Each structure stands twice: as structure tokens, then as C-alpha cells.
Amino acid sequence: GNKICQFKLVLLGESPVGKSSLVLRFVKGQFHEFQESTIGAAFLTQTVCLDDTTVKFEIWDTAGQERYHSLAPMYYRGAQAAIVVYDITNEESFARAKNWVKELQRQASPNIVIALSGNKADLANKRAVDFQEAQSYADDNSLLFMETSAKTSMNVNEIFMAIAKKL
Ligand SMILES: Nc1nc2c(ncn2[C@@H]2O[C@H](COP(=O)(O)OP(=O)(O)O)[C@@H](O)[C@H]2O)c(=O)[nH]1
Ligand SMILES: [Mg+2]
């Protein structure tokens, strides 16, 4: 197809749960066991083929520490989509994700598409957040949910593409 679309996406979530790793996997097809902590935010772009449209993603990868919370609106304000990420082995990160969802539903664009990534799914032997519980939470809050693994690539391209399809 000859159509071209572009949209802004922001990743939010407790540090560290794998936000930068998810972006690196999608954008560069790489994964770093030793990933440097993000300071403020980092920016990357990726262009993909979605049916008859060339979709370009402008991605803001935010630093998740609480000291950066006040900067968050600078990144989500004009976003068309967000991926709120938690680590499936860390229940506290899942609770933190729910608070990011609340903040987006109250302060971001009313039409923003919100995805929820249960990351580090490859560490299911250390699971702390039940898949069905997270799915029910996502369904009740109209969030696009998938468990992902930046380490193995499981559902990484899929979650980004599912978002693009719903814009
Ligand atoms: N096993 C596993 N480790 C991961 C995964 N995603 C990220 N990590 C590791 O978790 C650490 C933190 O990842 P990072 O992307 O920096 O987290 P951020 O602070 O949310 O950006 C790094 O050591 C990564 O290699 C994943 O899906 N599986
Ligand atoms: Mg990071």
C-alpha cells in the first residue's frame, strides 16, 4: 500500500521492569542483559508495515523512578498510545502499573489507546502476578494486555502491532 501513518507512543512503568528492553527489542531487534538505567527519557523510532499502511512509531521510553514522575506529562500529553509495563515476577510493579493507568485515564488524551505489558514472561517460574487476574484487570479497564518477554522476543512485535491496528 501507499498509505503512511505516524503516531506517538509512550512507555511508562516502575523501574526496572524492562521498558527500555521492550523498545530495544522492537526497534533494533536486540536485548541487553546489562541495560543502563534510563535518565529522564530516551527517544526511538520504528517504521513497520501494517496491511496497506506504512506506520511510523515515535517512541518515548520514560525513566520509571519516582523522582521522574513529575516529568511524565511531558511525554504522555500528546501521545496517541501508551504501554504501561510491569514485571510478572513483581507484584508491587503491577500495583504501580495500575496507578499509571489511572493517571493516564484522568490526565492524558481521552482517546489514548492504553496497552498493558506483563513483561519478563520468560521468568514464569518466579511469577507473582496471575495471568488471568491481569487479564481481568485489563478487560475491566479497556486495556490491550499481553505478557511479553523482551529477552526472548515473545509478543514484543505483537503488542506494538496490536496497538497500531487499534489506532
Ligand atoms: N529475563 C528477562 N529480563 C528482562 C526482560 N526485560 C528486561 N529484562 C532485564 O531487566 C533489566 C532492566 O531492564 P530495563 O529495560 O533497563 O528496564 P527499565 O528500567 O524498565 O527500562 C535488564 O537487566 C534487562 O536485561 C525480560 O523480558 N526478561
Ligand atoms: Mg529504561
Resolution (A): 1.5
**Cβ proximity of 75 and 109 under 8 Å:** no
Q: Which atom of ligand 1 is nearest to the CA of 13?
A: 20
CATH code of the domain covering residue 134 = 3.40.50.300
Q: What phi and psi values does residue 38 have, to the nearest 5 degrees?
A: -75, 140
Express the helix, strand and coil content of the chain in percent, nearest 5 each.
40, 30, 35
HSE-up (13 A, CA, CB side) for residue 73: 7
Which of 38, 34, 56, 39 has its CA nearest to residue 47?
56
Cα(87) to ligand 2 centroid in Å equals 13
The three grid cell numbers given for residue 14, joined into one nine-digit string: 516502575
Residue 16 belongs to what domain range? 1-167
Provide CB contacts within 8 A for 118, sequence distance 6+. Answer: 86, 88, 94, 129, 131, 134, 145, 146, 147, 148
**Cβ proximity of 86 and 14 under 8 Å:** yes
Provide CB contacts within 8 A for 110, sequence distance 6+. Answer: none
Number of structural domains in the chain? 1
Structure determined by: X-ray
